[PDB]
Design a protein around this nucleic acid. Structure first.
Lengths: 278, 278
DNA sequence: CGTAATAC
DNA sequence: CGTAATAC
């Protein structure tokens, strides 16, 4: 039998003792419209997060279903979609409260053409949600992905100097061997090449950022956020951890918990939730 | 019962009496690789044409199956595919003999980015194969299609001044009501809008070119070259004539026949064959 | 390899 | 609405 993973209960109190005051939820919906048909929005209303980040929406701004506009609580909504590619990439950020400033992309024309980054600045921190480019089957985009990784790292380092940073989304890499079920087989596959894993480790050390889930559960294995639709991967928990909450070190005393909502359906990714005490 | 169409026998002698010396075949394969799996190449070897034009190949140059390189007779092969779009558009031209000159596109940067035109110049005439942009569901590209139509018309008029011209391929318009099964329903659908039909009539008169099939069969109805995969259109012969051989008037004394190979499978389009006596 | 999405 | 093709 396959070894399954049960995410531990929500810890809503920081180590300092302060109660959690902010609840961010991130989910790669892999088809915003199909995700809504599969009752994804119902799960969101059940989670009731202060902020909701979505990746791989595959939805142009004009094609957004009407129910999203009428969603309760998360009234302030921002979307980014590729200029010239239909049904590809795309992210979104939905918040209960209005952000002070909202910008798009990372400032480099080469990397801002697929709608992968939304930046939402708040009084106490800056939230970035990202959908990092996949290296592709055959590694056709691995050279581009290394260029992106370097540009994205410099971008986040500049943001982090002025304000504490929270980064979330599909970062499209399993950092370590614990972060995917079959590491020996995937050393040359997109998501686990040495170039991608190194860029991730360089990102954590340069900005600097910490992997919230791994920080709290350093030896917890079999904890994935993605399973291919093929070969019953999700039934057999043959997965990858591609979806992260990376925090600035100064927010670590405010970190309460980082969750993996393994049971939530509607995508080949599952949602992840962050609890902070600000 | 639906009214079916039987293409009359091949007339291989021109009205002047000269025997046919050139046999051009054009086919919108709508998926070059799927077309080869469906034994499309076998049909080509059975037709044995001097020149073979293909449209909507949906195949990048590096992904072309190996059997195409080893095809007998049609050894000189030229392909055009979109720069930035995978599995979209694309044409090809295969000839028994080497052409004097082979160029790509129509010379306008805006219209040469999807690989829709190949021009093959020969001693006695210039052959153009085209895959004209579809106006799209909802007519999103109808404004662009009118701009293309004007640029393409001027391009062909310049070619025709120096040499007699033969144009073939999917021109993505049913000229007249006879050219599609349900004209009253499609007046606002891509392929039969007033803008597309007028651009086609302006093309015939400006260059000038003649519709070879319609020239030879002025009152022959129910003669289509395309049927949607949906709703058993091909079984019920609910079709469109979108694929043409348009000739310069000076080649009309050399015109022997223009055929519609209704029974040839492998695509939602069927092939068309032209016989000339040069 | 499953699924969602495009284009026609 | 069928089919082929993409991207993951």
């Amino acid at each position: 039998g396959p070894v399954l993973y049960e995410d531990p209960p929500d810890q809503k109190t920081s180590p300092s003792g302060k109660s959690a005051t902010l609840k961010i939820c991130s989910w790669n919906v892999d088809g915003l419209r199909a995700w809504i048909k599969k009752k994804g929005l119902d799960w969101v209303k059940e989670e009731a997060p202060d902020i909701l980040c979505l990746q791989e929406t595959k939805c142009s701004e004009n094609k957004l279903p009407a129910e999203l506009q009428e969603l309760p609580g998360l009234t302030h909504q921002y979307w980014s979609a590729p200029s010239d590619k239909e049904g590809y990439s795309g992210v979104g950020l939905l918040s209960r409260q209005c952000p002070l400033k909202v910008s798009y992309g990372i400032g480099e024309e080469e990397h801002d053409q697929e709608g992968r980054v939304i930046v939402a600045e708040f009084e106490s921190f800056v939230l970035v949600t990202a959908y990092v480019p996949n290296a592709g089957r055959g590694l056709v985009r691995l050279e581009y992905r290394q260029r992106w990784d370097e540009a994205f790292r410099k971008f986040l380092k500049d943001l982090a100097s002025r304000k504490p940073l929270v980064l979330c989304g599909d970062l499209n890499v399993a950092h370590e061997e614990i972060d995917l079920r079959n590491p020996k087989g995937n050393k040359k596959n997109a998501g686990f090449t040495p170039q991608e894993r190194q860029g991730f480790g360089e990102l954590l050390q340069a900005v600097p950022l910490a992997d919230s889930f791994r920080h709290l559960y350093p030896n917890t294995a079999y904890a994935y956020t993605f399973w291919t639709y093929m070969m019953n991967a999700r039934s057999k928990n043959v997965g990858w951890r591609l979806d992260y909450f990376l925090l600035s070190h100064s927010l670590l005393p405010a970190l309460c918990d980082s969750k993996i909502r393994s049971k939530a359906l509607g995508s080949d990714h599952c949602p992840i939730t962050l609890y902070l005490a600000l």
